[PDB]
Amino acid sequence: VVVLSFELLHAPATVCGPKKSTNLVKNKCVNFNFNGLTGTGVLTKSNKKF
Amino acid sequence: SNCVADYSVLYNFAPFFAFKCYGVSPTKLNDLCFTNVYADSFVIKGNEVS
Amino acid sequence: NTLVKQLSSKFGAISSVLNDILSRLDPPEAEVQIDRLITGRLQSLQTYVT
Amino acid sequence: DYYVGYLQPRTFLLKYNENGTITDAVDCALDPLSETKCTLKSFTV
Numbered sequence: 001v002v003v004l005s006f007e008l009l010h011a012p013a014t015v016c017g018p019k020k021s022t023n024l025v026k027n028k029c030v031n032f033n034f035n036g037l038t039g040t041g042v043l044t045k046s047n048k049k050f
Numbered sequence: 051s052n053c054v055a056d057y058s059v060l061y062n063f064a065p066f067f068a069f070k071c072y073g074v075s076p077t078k079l080n081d082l083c084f085t086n087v088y089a090d091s092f093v094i095k096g097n098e099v100s
Numbered sequence: 101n102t103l104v105k106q107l108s109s110k111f112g113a114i115s116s117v118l119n120d121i122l123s124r125l126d127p128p129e130a131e132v133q134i135d136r137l138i139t140g141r142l143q144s145l146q147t148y149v150t
Numbered sequence: 151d152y153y154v155g156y157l158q159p160r161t162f163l164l165k166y167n168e169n170g171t172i173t174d175a176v177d178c179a180l181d182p183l184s185e186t187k188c189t190l191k192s193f194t195v
């Protein structure tokens with residue numbers, strides 16, 4: 001018996017499946033998947049002081 | 051961790067007595083990202099698998 | 101503000117984010133988690149209108 | 151000089167600035183006034 005234990009928290013760490021990344025598109029309404037975070041919106045350059 | 055979470059190897063490795071996923075579907079594991087994957091390996095009896 | 105804040109509630113679901121439910125679970129399971137969110141959202145909107 | 155304190159489960163009201171930093175905090179079980187501040191989610195009552 002092997003138990004694969006994990007947590008899904010919008011990927012603070014990745015360990016992602018065999019998916020292929022594409023190029024970024026900015027200032028357009030696009031669908032997106034960022035390390036599993038899934039949604040639709042317009043992505044812009046951020047000026048938030050992270 | 052720090053790896054590509056390719057789960058097709060589990061289905062290719064062997065047929066299993068049970069493959070039961072609780073948090074996710076067993077066929078969506080290759081689309082998701084996992085913060086920390088832990089594999090807990092142990093041997094139990096059939097009457098204890100449940 | 102209350103009506104928007106209720107969007108973060110799980111109402112018994114694994115996640116308040118619909119895309120996480122659809123990404124992680126196959127239709128027959130996703131429908132259960134989604135029905136839990138729909139029920140909570142229905143009471144939130146009905147309370148707001150009342 | 152050396153100091154040691156211990157953590158406990160507590161609820162805090164954390165005040166953030168325009169930048170991603172915490173400027174103040176209220177310990178919600180310290181004082182009736184702090185509990186009120188947490189209830190209202192304000193540092194002014």
Ligand SMILES: *[C@@H]1O[C@H](CO)[C@@H](O[C@@H]2O[C@H](CO)[C@@H](O)[C@H](O)[C@H]2NC(C)=O)[C@H](O)[C@H]1NC(C)=O
Nearest residue numbers: 047048049050165166167168169170171172173
């Ligand atoms: C928040 O961060 C900014 C820098 O990112 C701090 O500095 C101010 O930045 C603005 C940017 O337009 C300048 O116009 C101000 O003059 C800067 N401040 C000073 C004193 O020169 C800003 O101080 C930070 N805020 C806090 C509360 O720490």
